[PDB]
């Protein structure tokens, strides 16, 4: 490879560790401003159900109760280049849980790919796809 | 607040496709030699475990990887899995099991013409060693690339086990006498 496969997981997981900070804090106390962490073209498949386009998603967002979010676990895996040609990007598993206003405290699980974006400054990553489901979602 | 849904496919041959996939992944991964699935993962594929933070599951807490909480980059970097042999190697490592396939809940969340990710809810049992008999519940996330055939091809692989809650077992479990 012409890149130490090493560097590409170092990589992954500093990008999913700050990458899964900003989010969930975003998603609490600033859910105006989660939609711009997403691409123009990503979509949710949110407990069965698809949500398409960075203006869709923001009104999903928004739509959403005020949340309470406890990360627990984080995984992450560098994504094999055959699956997205010239595309650096991050698959990233995340379990915790969540209460949304006018509910009770529940478990849940979020996976979503990163894709790296290159720029003047540092390089910013963004949620391509994402999905996310209640561990009790049928009750 | 939008009404959770079960598994979600997008289409009809997508769903053939994931559907069946799953099918052969698992009959071979139940079976008590999981070196079929050589034939399944992409020579450069990567595999990775996670269980909870917060009926033991003491066999798959070695190579559980969690970066939230294990920080050092080099203990990091061998908990992932590379290449087919040590992801299959290290597969046929863990328990024996006997998933419930056609209960699975999966979801499809991405598609291009060279890359599939698809991520399976369900349960399975662990057929022998101290926990067996125990039921236990998993999300596993897949991503795969067309396979010379019509098939998949696994590239990245991240099992999450956990113990299945109360609610479950007696879901999994329940085969009352029917009544009106």
Known sequence: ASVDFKTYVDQACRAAEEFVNV???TM???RRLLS????????????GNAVSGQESLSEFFEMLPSSEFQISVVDCQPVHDEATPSQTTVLVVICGSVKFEGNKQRD??????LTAQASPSNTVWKIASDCFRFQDWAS | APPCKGSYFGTENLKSLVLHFLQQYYAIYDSGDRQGLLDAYHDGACCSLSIPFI?????????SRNVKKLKDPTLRFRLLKHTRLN???????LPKTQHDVNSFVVDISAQTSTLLCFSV???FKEVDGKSRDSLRAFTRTFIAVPASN???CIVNDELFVRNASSEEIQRAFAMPAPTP
Do not use: C, H, P
């Not at chain 1, 849940?108 to 790919?113: E, H, L, V």
């Open chain 1, 23 to 25: 989010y969930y804090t």
């Open chain 1, 28 to 30: 609490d106390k600033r």
């Open chain 1, 36 to 47: 711009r962490l997403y691409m123009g073209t990503a979509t949710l498949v949110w407990n």
């Open chain 1, 108 to 113: 849940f699980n979020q996976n979503f790919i």
């Open chain 2, 55 to 63: 009926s033991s599951l003491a066999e798959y807490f070695k190579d």
């Open chain 2, 87 to 93: 992801v299959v190697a290290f597969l046929n490592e």
């Open chain 2, 121 to 123: 809810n369900g349960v």
């Open chain 2, 150 to 152: 019509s098939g998949l």
